[PDB]
Amino acid sequence: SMSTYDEIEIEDMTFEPENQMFTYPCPCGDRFQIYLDDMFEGEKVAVCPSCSLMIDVVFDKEDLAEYYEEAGIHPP
Amino acid sequence: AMSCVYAFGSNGQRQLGLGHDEDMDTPQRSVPGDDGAIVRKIACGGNHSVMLTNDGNLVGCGDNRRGELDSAQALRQVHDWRPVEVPAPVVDVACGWDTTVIVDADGRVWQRGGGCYEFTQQHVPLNSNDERIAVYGCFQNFVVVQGTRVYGWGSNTKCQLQEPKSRSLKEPVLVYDTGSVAVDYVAMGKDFMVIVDEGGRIVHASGRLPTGFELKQQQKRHNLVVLCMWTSIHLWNARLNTVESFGRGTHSQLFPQERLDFPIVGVATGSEHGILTTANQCYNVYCWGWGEHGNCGPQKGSQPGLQLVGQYSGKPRVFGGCATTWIVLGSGSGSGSGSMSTYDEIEIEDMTFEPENQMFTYPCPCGDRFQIYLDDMFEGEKVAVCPSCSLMIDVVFDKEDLAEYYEEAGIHP
Amino acid sequence: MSCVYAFGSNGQRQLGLGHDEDMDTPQRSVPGDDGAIVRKIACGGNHSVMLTNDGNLVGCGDNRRGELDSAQALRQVHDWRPVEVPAPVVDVACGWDTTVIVDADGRVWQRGGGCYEFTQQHVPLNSNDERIAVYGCFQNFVVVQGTRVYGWGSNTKCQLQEPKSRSLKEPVLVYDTGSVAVDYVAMGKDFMVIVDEGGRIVHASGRLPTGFELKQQQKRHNLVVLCMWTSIHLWNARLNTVESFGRGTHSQLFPQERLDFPIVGVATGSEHGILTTANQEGKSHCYNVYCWGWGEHGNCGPQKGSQPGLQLVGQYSGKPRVFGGCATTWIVLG
Amino acid sequence: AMSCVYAFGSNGQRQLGLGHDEDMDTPQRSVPGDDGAIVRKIACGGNHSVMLTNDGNLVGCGDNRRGELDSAQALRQVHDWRPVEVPAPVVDVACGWDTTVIVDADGRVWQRGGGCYEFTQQHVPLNSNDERIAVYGCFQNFVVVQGTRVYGWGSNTKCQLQEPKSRSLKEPVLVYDTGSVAVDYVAMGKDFMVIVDEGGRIVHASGRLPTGFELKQQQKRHNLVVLCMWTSIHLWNARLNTVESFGRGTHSQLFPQERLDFPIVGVATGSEHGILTTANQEGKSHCYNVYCWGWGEHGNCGPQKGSQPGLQLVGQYSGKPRVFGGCATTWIVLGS
Amino acid sequence: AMSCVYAFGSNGQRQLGLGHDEDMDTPQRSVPGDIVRKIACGGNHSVMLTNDGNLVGCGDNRRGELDSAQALRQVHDWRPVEVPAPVVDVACGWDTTVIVDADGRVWQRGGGCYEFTQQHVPLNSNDERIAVYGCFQNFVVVQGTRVYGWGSNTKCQLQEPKSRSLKEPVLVYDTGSVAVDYVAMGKDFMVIVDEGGRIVHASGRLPTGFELKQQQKRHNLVVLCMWTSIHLWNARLNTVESFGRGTHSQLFPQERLDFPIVGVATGSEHGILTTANCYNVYCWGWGEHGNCGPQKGSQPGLQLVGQYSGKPRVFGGCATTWIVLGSGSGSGSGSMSTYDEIEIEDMTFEPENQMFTYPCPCGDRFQIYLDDMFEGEKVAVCPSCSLMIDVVFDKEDLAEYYEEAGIHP
Amino acid sequence: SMSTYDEIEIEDMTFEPENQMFTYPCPCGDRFQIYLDDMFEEKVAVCPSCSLMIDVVFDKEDLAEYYEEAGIHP
Ligand SMILES: [Fe+3]
Ligand SMILES: [Fe+3]
Ligand SMILES: [Fe+3]
Ligand SMILES: [Fe+3]
Known part of the structure; x- marks a missing residue:
């Protein structure tokens, strides 16, 4: 398993409907990122592209249906 | 006679x-x-830094993709230090992840960034007197403190402002009211808050407090200096000359519990790193915690202990940001060596009163004279300024001490 | 199960x-x-090989020299495809364009380097409980059984025997202890270092990098020897540090400062080092993985400037197995 | 024989x-x-400068709105160097904020400025001996030293002359008597005072002494040289080849504590800046380096006016220079 | 691939x-x-040469030291310098900039001319590399053995006698046997050193205490030069002998050094010492602009200005100090030089396209053309990284591969 | 009594026609400067932004060349 920097609730994550990606501020200035599709498969670890930090996304499968709907409503 | 600003660490924007x-x-x-x-003061966000000059001007640099700095929506990044447009001279300033909140001399609170590219006024119920207005901010929350009352707005997902949970609070609410002692400052972390009065006592705490921090146990203490990282609380204990840290220490954020050979003279924290200032055999500056971007020094391994990042003649003022470290020399504020601050304290009886123009004068090392008006001192002004240089002096007097000179000058007070 | 992570040079x-x-x-x-x-991950110049506990072998990368698949038409294995073996694999190593395996029957097979078929390397070995280990780097390979250390391949720097030779197709006796059993053989580009089970350097051959004095190093005990292409790295567990010897043009030389974090594992690629330490701050004991040396391909982390010092690439709950490669870094965790 | 006078710093008047x-x-x-x-000597006021030569002549320049230089009231400011009219040849001279005090060859003490445009004789109770009569002054206080006795007049708001507090003392009073070892000199600051004997020991201190300076401990030291800025005391320690400062040091008035590889041969201080004379012994020709430290935003410490800590080289000279300091003004006197 | 360039000192422009x-x-x-290979400094401007042959400069431009535009009085931040061809070597004067291209022709700008004016110098057309050196108001071009130079001549540093300047280059000195390694230049003097570490010729106003006849008899010496002083690096005694007034500590501390000297550089009136330890860099001499460190009193001794893991390259300018880690030089640690020395017998020859290949730690291969090697090139380059290796071979070793390929050389 | 950095011939100096002032390059990057009137009276040039000094070597003559180029004096 990974050693996470923090545990973040899915309602605290910044959802981006353009690409179905959840983002969260990283202490280095960048953002932890994790895709909706990966979360639907069972993955819960967000990853920062700039540093070595990682965080856990706390969610359930019954929480993901909301964000899939928001992704389809989002304009072209 | 300017300030020597040192900066190092994350520099992505x-x-x-x-x-x-x-x-x-x-x-x-x-x-x-x-x-x-x-x-005078440096405030840092996620990817932008804001400096407050000693004459009420803001100068900033960094990311502008959220409107943190410039109002031009086309401008994505402010490359070099450029003046931040303000509606009025700035008294205090704080920053969020992508936001900038200021406080002017008129007593109005303005906020920019986070999508908005213009300074939008925050309407917080404040009084109109000598009680100054200070602003503190971190991550997605800001706090305005005036004397006793503590107001704040922003995220409320961990009940760091009120109850129950809320995704955000646009309109400021009453976070906490002491009802007695004046609130000194507010140490803010990520989704948690700690309030400290002028007695050094933790009066109130809110939000998702880091593990190991027993609030009811810490409130019984006093003479404390509370520092905060995003996920940790750091208690400066001057009496034991140590720093008590709380929460997980996955990246050496927890202060080294080893006995220090020199007295602590100042402690500052960034996002996930701390800055320690101690005396010497003149002034040493150490950094600990997560620092794989250089904010802790050449060794970016986040190993435990304190990295000596510099040694200074005068006591420097340190500021912490998101994986960034700021060291300021000659801030113009303070009372230490090489601080470029107040020159001397002079009793009003030593001042030279001039009834011809209602003014008190006092000899200046340049050859001129520090000057201060009588009516201004009736309003509470206790600073005389030289007309040809930085220097200035504090004039010690009481309100009833002015009644003598009003009579000598022949002016009704 | 085992989760395998990788980063660095991915051109092939x-x-x-x-x-x-x-x-x-x-x-x-x-x-x-x-x-x-x-069980083990072995890397070549542009091809990677992963050995599992079930004896199955799987690889990916360049096949223009027959490194992986027998099909001469196939120039590159796209994803992790099973490497065809005559028998279950016990141990495996890789060369610049070669792949050598050791099966359960005790046979040593070699493919690649022009040969698109597994050709059995006839090395004189025993038939007992003494396990047969294989080691390889660049254009050389070494098979170790008990006390004996055999090897073939290149010999331009006299890494196998004397005098110089462009190649030695048939396995020759590189060295015999002949008392203490040989633990492993750390191999560089054109040199070789043999270590016993006592942590002592028993023998060294080939073009050894500058600064490394073999006579002075044989007087030392309890050492772990890692080898890059043009440098040797000594893991002193007692002093908790890594002693490096080489030109160090791109920060290959380990930062000779005493680490606070206890070193629990050391691995080396072609020109970069992979350090695993223990992080015992906080309630949960975790493990930090650092990288140093030439890593402009990102094999050392986001910082590709090849600057001196350790670079943190990740924290993990359990102790991971790290493996080196040609500008590639592998992290394996359960 | 000729003296070459060099000056820089505050020049407003x-x-x-x-x-x-x-x-x-x-x-x-x-x-x-x-x-x-x-x-012989250069004394500086707040805005007026006074230069004394060996021939007993006094010349001055600067402000005169307080009567520091000339008796002519309509002379607001003395343009260039003008002969300061004196009743007798001047042997020693000292300046206050807006005052000028001289000692003549007859042994009398005269004072002008601070309102008075006329040279008024200061009647200090002296003895009819051959003992030299020295005068020292700063801000609003003057001191006359003869033998072992030290007399002084002027301000007394901080009890720098006697007790208790007085707004001013027009008549000279006995500040201190040793009364054995002869007093070398008196280092004066703003509303405070330090007395030193010929042994290099601090005999007595009075007035608002700056922070960190504990008189009781400093009296147990020998072979010292005491300099005084307005709000700081400085101790030239030739044994350790350094200068020990005592003050808030808001503008780098505190001497750099680092080691000096050049031997110190002379130390002087202005209002809020120090002047260091060192011997450059590198090479065949031994020359002299002159450094400045402290508050110098008027260029009185050199080209760099940021008042940054450390010594700032301002010039190098063949022969040993004689340095003088005033209110943000630096003087360098030579000889050729 | 990136060079870390540190800089401090006079920054008025x-x-x-x-x-x-x-x-x-x-x-x-x-x-x-x-990747930075060499740094050249002028009076108030700086020039930085990269490995790919590009010049990037910054500083004063009131004399045309950098940009061609006359309206540009000063170059804010690093800006590219327009060159007619890839630069191999670059030197600087008080207000000038002289370059040497791969074509083997010398150009000069600044000092009044806002355009690169070609300096016609009688040189050859072979493997002999063309190096350039310059200081104050003089420049010197050395292709090997022969030494040409132009500029001022008020102190007879070019010929005899006088006057002012010489726009047309003249033959300063020819050995004419042993090749010239470098030419150390001062304000109004000049010292020529061969590859034997021997001072061959010196012209101009030499500083006091420096007798030429006494020094020419010596060998294995490294000569450095400030404006008004000559400094000899005696590696055998591990010290630096200085010659000059030394009014501002320019004279190197003749005290006993604890660690071996590994590098000596000089600015206008200050020296930069590099010793072992991992690597310490010291600065002595006149440095009241902070160019010698925080202590700006020009006191005698060595000021520690930093410590580095790998052996750094150093350059000195007019009251400025430059420290570059991971340059494009040779040898040393953390210098990012040539990766490894490889014999031609260990190379892989490809007769199809006349090319020698050798494995690279990135996974690719160092390549080098046969035709290039016949002209005297010995460095193989990897398509995909900073790497470079040196191929050891002789001219008579190429005949075997030309025969295998079937091409006449 | 000026301890100088170097002695420079008046012919080697740089003359700015309008200012009646000779300049010479300085190791700090600036330029030493001396006035012609002071030379008729001083042989020392001073750098504005440093602390070095140089001597301008000349006799009690050979200054008419620059006097005539100035268009005025003596
Ligand atoms: Fe990050
Ligand atoms: Fe003033
Ligand atoms: Fe490569
Ligand atoms: Fe200069």
Whole structure:
């Protein structure tokens, strides 16, 4: 398993409907990122592209249906 | 006579004011404009840095993709130190992840960034007197403190402002009211808050407090200095000359519990790193915690202990940001060596009163005279300024001490 | 199961990620099994090989020299495809364009380097409980059984025997102790270092890098020897540090400062080092993985400037197995 | 024989004798009437400068709105170097904020300025001996030293003369008597005072002494040289080849504690800046380096006016220079 | 692949490339916009040469030292310098800039001319590399054995006798046997050193205490030069012998050094010492602009200005100090030089396209063309990384491969 | 009594026609400067932004060349 920097609730994550990606501020200035599709498969670890930090996304499968709907409503 | 600003650490969006976007591990001289500026206070966000000059002007640099700095929506990044447009001279300033909140001399709270590209006024119920208005902010929350009352707004997902949970609070609410002692400052972390009065006592705490922190146990203490990282609380204990840290220490954020050989004279924290200032055999500056971007020094391994990042003649003022470290020399504020602060304290009886123009004068080392008006002192002004240089002096007097000179001058007070 | 992560030079898709883009952060590399427990990962110049506990071998990367698949038409293995073996594999190593395996029957097979078929390397060995280990780097390979150390391949720097030779197709006796059993053989480009089970350097051959005085090093005990292409790295467990010897043009030389974190594992690629330490701050004891040396392909992390010092690439709950490669870094965790 | 006077710093009232009123960051030639006479001493006020030569002549330049220089009230400011009219040849001289005090060859003490445009004799109870009569002054206090006795007059708001507090003492009073070892000199600051004997020991201190300076402990030391800025005390320790400062040091008035590889041969201080004379012994020709430290935003410490800590080289000279300091003004006197 | 360039000292014209114009006393990372081989400094301008042959400069431009536009009085931050051809070597004067292209022709700008004026110098057309050196108001071009130079001549540093300047280059000195390694130049003097470490010829106003006839008899010496002083690096005695007035500590501390000297560089009136330890860099001499460190009193002794893991390359300018890690030089640690020395017998020859290949740690191969090697090139380059290796071979070793390929040389 | 950095011939100096002032390059990057009137009276040039000094070597003559180029004096 990974050693996470923090545990973040899915309602605290910044959802981006353009690409179905959840983002969260990283202490280095960048953002932890994790895709909706990966979360639907069972993955819960967000990853920062700039540093070595990682965080856990706390969610359930019954929480993901909301964000899939928001992704389809989002304009072209 | 400017301030020597040193900056190093994360520099992805040129938020170090160096012109380039290279991460630094050793203190680089950050010079705003050509000649520089007298920096009083530095506030840092996720990818942007804001400096408050001693004359109420803001100068910033870094990311502008959220409207943190410039109002031009087309401008994505402010490369070098550029003046931040303000509606009025700034008294205090704080920053969020992508936001900038200021407080003017008129007593109005303005906020920019986070999508908005214009300073939108925050309407907080405040009084109109000598009680100054200070602003503190971190991550997605800001706090305005006036004397006793503590107001705040922003995120409320961990009940760091009120109950129950809320995704955000646009309109400011009453976070806490002491009802007695004046609130000194508010140490803010990520989704948690700690309130400290002038007695050094923790009066109130809210939000998702880091593990190990027993609030009811800590409130029984006093003479404490509370520092905060995003996920940790750090209690400066001057009496035992140590720093007590709380929460997980996955990246050495927890202060080294080893006995220090020198007295602590100052403690500052960034996002996930701490800055320690101690005396010497003159002044040493150490960094600990997560620092794989150079904010802790050349060793970016986040190993435990304290990295000596610099040694200074006078006591420096340190500021912590998101993986960035700021060291300021000659802030113009304080009372230590090489601080460029107040020159001397003079009793009003030593001052030279001039009834011809209602003014008190006192000899200046340059050859001129510090000057101060009588009516201004009736309003509470206790500072005489030289007309040809930085120096200034504090005039010690009481309100009833002015009644003598009003009579000598022949003016009704 | 075993989760395999990889990053670095990916020009020939040797990371098993499917794409040819160089990475600077640990990427989830997934074969067609994953549920099985990884034993060892061996890397060549542009091809990677993963040995599992079930004896199955799987590889990916360049096949223009027959490194992986027998099909001469196939120039590159796209994803993690099973490497055809005559028998279950016990141990495996790789050369610049070669792959050598050691099966359960005790036979040593070699493919690649022009040969698209597994050709049995006839090395004189015994038939008992003494395990047969294989080691390899660049253009050389070494088979170790008990006390004997055999080897073949190149010999331009007299790494096998004397005098110089362009190649030695048939396995010759490199060295015999002949008392203490040989633990392993750390191999560089054109040199060789033999270590016993006592942590002592028993013998060294080939073009040894500058600064390394063999006579002075044989008087030392309890050492762990790692080898890059042009440098030797000594892991002194007692002093908790890594002693390095080489030109160090791109920061290959370990930062000779005493580490606070206890070193629990050391691995080396072609020109970069991989350090695993213990992080015992906080309630949970975790493990930090650092990288140093030439890593402009991102094999040392996001910082590709090849600056001196350790670079943190990740924290993990359990102690991971790290493996080196040609500008590639592998992290394996359960 | 000839003295070459160099001056720079605050020049708001043309007290640099340069003829103009521009602040200088580099040494400038200050040529008086007799630029061939040997300079004995240079005393500086707040805005007026006074130069004394061996021939007993006094010349001055700078402000005169308080009567520091000339008896003519309509002379607001003395443009260039002008002969200061004296009742007798001057042997020693000292300046206050807006006052000038002299000691003549007859042994009398005269004071002008601070309102009075006339040289008024200060009647200090002296003895009819051959003992030299020295005068020292700063801000609003003057001191006359003869033998072992130290007399003084002026301000007394901080009890720098006697007890208790007085707004002013017009008549000279006995500040201190040793009364064995002869007093070498008296280092004066703003509303405070330090007395030193010929043994290099601090015999007595009075007035608002700056923080960190504990008189009781400093009296147990020998072979010292005491300098005084307005709000700081400085101790030249030749044994350790360094200067020990005592003050808040808001503008780098505190001498750099680092090791000096050059031997110190002379130390002087202005209002809020120090002047260091060192011996450059590197090479065949031994020359002298002059450094400045402390508050120098008027260019009185050199080209760099940021008042940054550390010594700032302002010039190098063949022979040993004699340095003098005033209110943000630096004087360098030579000889050729 | 990136060189870390540190810079501090006089910054009155932004020649440090830091953006601001404040003088620095501590090494600041100078970053060219968003691999450096050599740094040349002038009076108030700086020139930085890269491995790919490009020049990037910053500083004063009131004499045309950098940009051709006359309206540009000063170059803010690092900006590219327009060159007619890839530069191999670059030197600087008080207000000038002289370059040497791969074509083997010398250009000069600055000092009044806002355009690169070609300096016609009688040179050959072979493997002999063309090096250039310059200081104050004089420049010297050395292709090997022969030494040409132009500029001022008020102190007879070019010929005899006088006067002012010489626009047309003249033959300063010819050995004519042993090749000239370098030419150390001062303000109004000049010292020529061969590859034997022997002073061959010296012209101009030599500083006091320096007798030429006494020094010519010596060998294995490294000659460095300030404006008014000559400094000899005696590696055998591990010290630096200085010759001059030394009014501001220019004379190297003749005290016993604890660690072996590994590098000596000089500015206008200050020296930069590099010793072992991992690597310490010291600065002595006149440095009241912070160019010698925080202590700007020009006191005698060595000021520690920093410590480095790998052996750094150093350059000195007019009251400025440059420290570059991971340059494009040779040998040393952390210098990012040539990766490894490989014999031609260990190379892989490809007769199809006349090319020699050798494995690279990145996974690719170092390549080098046969035709290039016949002209005297010995460095193989990897398509995909900073790497470079040196191929050891002789001219008579190429005949075997020309026969295998079937091509006449 | 000026301890100088170097002695420079008046012919080697640089003359700015309008200012009646000779300049010479300085190791700090600036330039030493001396006035012609002071030379008829001083042989020392001073750098504005440093602390070095140089001597301008000349006799009690050979200054008419620059006097005539100035268009005025003596
Ligand atoms: Fe990050
Ligand atoms: Fe003033
Ligand atoms: Fe490569
Ligand atoms: Fe200069």
